[PDB]
Amino acid sequence: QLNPESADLRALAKHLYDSYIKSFPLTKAKARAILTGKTTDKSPFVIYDMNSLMMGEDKIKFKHITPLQEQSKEVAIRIFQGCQFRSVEAVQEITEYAKSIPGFVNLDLNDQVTLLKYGVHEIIYTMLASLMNKDGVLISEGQGFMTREFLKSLRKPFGDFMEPKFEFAVKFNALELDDSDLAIFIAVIILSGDRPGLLNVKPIEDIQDNLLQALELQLKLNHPESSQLFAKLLQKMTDLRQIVTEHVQLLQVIKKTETDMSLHPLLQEIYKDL
Amino acid sequence: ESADLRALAKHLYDSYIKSFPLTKAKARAILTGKTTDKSPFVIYDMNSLMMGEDKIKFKHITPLQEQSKEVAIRIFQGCQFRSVEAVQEITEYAKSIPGFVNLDLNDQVTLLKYGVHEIIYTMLASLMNKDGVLISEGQGFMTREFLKSLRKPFGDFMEPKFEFAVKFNALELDDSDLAIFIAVIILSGDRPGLLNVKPIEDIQDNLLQALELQLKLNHPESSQLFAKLLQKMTDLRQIVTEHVQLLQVIKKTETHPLLQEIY
Numbered sequence A: 001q002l003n004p005e006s007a008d009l010r011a012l013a014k015h016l017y018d019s020y021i022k023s024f025p026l027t028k029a030k031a032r033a034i035l036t037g038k039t040t041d042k043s044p045f046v047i048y049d050m051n052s053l054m055m056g057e058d059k060i061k062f063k064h065i066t067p068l069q070e071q072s073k074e075v076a077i078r079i080f081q082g083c084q085f086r087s088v089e090a091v092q093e094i095t096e097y098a099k100s101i102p103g104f105v106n107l108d109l110n111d112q113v114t115l116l117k118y119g120v121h122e123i124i125y126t127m128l129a130s131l132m133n134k135d136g137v138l139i140s141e142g143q144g145f146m147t148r149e150f151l152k153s154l155r156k157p158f159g160d161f162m163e164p165k166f167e168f169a170v171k172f173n174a175l176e177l178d179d180s181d182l183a184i185f186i187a188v189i190i191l192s193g194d195r196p197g198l199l200n201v202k203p204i205e206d207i208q209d210n211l212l213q214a215l216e217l218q219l220k221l222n223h224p225e226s227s228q229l230f231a232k233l234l235q236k237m238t239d240l241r242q243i244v245t246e247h248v249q250l251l252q253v254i255k256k257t258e259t260d261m262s263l264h265p266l267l268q269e270i271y272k273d274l
Numbered sequence B: 001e002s003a004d005l006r007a008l009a010k011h012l013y014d015s016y017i018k019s020f021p022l023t024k025a026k027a028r029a030i031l032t033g034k035t036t037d038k039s040p041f042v043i044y045d046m047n048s049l050m051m052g053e054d055k056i057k058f059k060h061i062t063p064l065q066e067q068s069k070e071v072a073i074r075i076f077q078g079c080q081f082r083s084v085e086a087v088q089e090i091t092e093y094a095k096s097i098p099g100f101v102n103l104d105l106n107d108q109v110t111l112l113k114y115g116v117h118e119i120i121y122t123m124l125a126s127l128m129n130k131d132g133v134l135i136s137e138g139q140g141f142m143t144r145e146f147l148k149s150l151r152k153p154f155g156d157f158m159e160p161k162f163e164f165a166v167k168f169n170a171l172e173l174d175d176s177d178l179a180i181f182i183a184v185i186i187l188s189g190d191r192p193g194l195l196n197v198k199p200i201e202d203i204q205d206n207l208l209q210a211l212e213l214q215l216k217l218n219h220p221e222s223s224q225l226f227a228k229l230l231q232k233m234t235d236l237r238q239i240v241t242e243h244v245q246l247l248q249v250i251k252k253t254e255t256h257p258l259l260q261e262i263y
């Protein structure tokens, strides 16, 4: 029965979950509630083509999304500008979450930065899965839903950015994880220790050990019938890396085909020598 | 089931010793000095190699003319030949994994094709240390500096594995641990082209339970070792995609018609 040690690991879990809800406006629970439509008040406006996209701007928010524009001959780029600024915002959120992880702020400032530098995108694609289903992704805080088929057409350089995310999403979602799980998983991810350039690895590893211990307990307590979910979830981390590198390769292509498109310093500092 | 798991472990271990001549222990004893008594020929430079060819006379890969005249390429060609042997050793070990042979033959083939590179590097770590690698059945030891000393893309091939090895070996797994770990890699349900994923994943689930238990009893001390080891599959996958890159780059070089057929 309940051990004194597992007692500490549950508190850590409740803490991270609590911090997660506090740091992320749109949880997986709200996303699913919107997608599985158990509502008449949360249904999103669907974008699957230009006209609906046109209607989209009309029916929903997002002008704050993409700033430097009156438009631009291309929808493909306009969308890119949006997903770009929104990533900026996610780093911001993830960064606020990191600070709540016990021990993270007590680490060397240079290592805190490197952990975020590499962990940010692996985290972004994990959570992005929460907003997806095999047919599309929620947008503008849940008010919209852009179809997977619209995105895959977009163009030639851009109709290839999201497919790998859906690929991972459909599979990662198969694990049926909920917010309380993801909160700890997201923590492990940031607290790697094998991140290129860490000055002091040991302290990071001890924090992760503990976080790994919290996740293990949490996964078995929340999914008793799910055999080896822990091991199965960890293996998923390799799918996140390929998403990342496959993405960077894509970005580099953008930097040449679109010399007129501005990116974003933050995202650039993140990618710089990644 | 805790007994069933220890049986799976022992059977894999017993099976692993059967399929693999040079064990992590034999490789360690050698790398360190103990009990072997007959130290390896060191290849730390050109004369070392040239002299090595006639000693370890590891002349298999080479024997053939049309090549015995370009050192850096006779070395890479070296890794090839040996890697083809290991593959046959991996495939044999695979067939001992309970449930493997019962699977769809095409899947067995698919699991082996995508899994061998990952198994080759895991086992390469067993024969490496921060300063060098064990070659030709453990008879030799080609230094790490010498490998970088190789030019073109060549001095780049091995470095990434040494870097991986140093990190992997830090886990201090032994042959008993690796036997199970290698079986996990093979039973990966995410290999492209698979026809019947369920049996593969059910086998791996069971192999993972065995591996987890093996690490608890074998290293009660190392907390969360199981997790840290799984996180290593990320390093392997990446290290494999890269290796594949250099092969790409490598083609802007020299490569018999029956020889290339084997490799």
Ligand SMILES: *C(/C=C\CCCCC)=C1/C(=O)C=C(SC[C@H](NC(=O)CC[C@H](N)C(=O)O)C(=O)NCC(=O)O)[C@@H]1C/C=C\CCCC(=O)O
Pocket (backbone or CB within 6 Å): A026, A062, A065, A066, A078, A079, A080, A081, A082, A083, A084, A085, A086, A087, A089, A090, A093, A094, A123, A124, A125, A127, A128, A131, A137, A138, A139, A140, A141, A142, A161, A162, A267
């Ligand atoms: C970007 C694709 C890849 C990530 C690139 C990162 C920089 C290298 C995304 C995309 O195309 C769609 C989304 S969904 C974002 C959603 N808002 C919108 O969909 C509005 C989009 C706009 N109309 C447009 O596309 O022009 C949202 O709720 N985002 C949360 C937020 O912004 O904080 C992804 C967005 C990237 C990350 C979101 C998940 C990360 C996390 O929650 O940790």
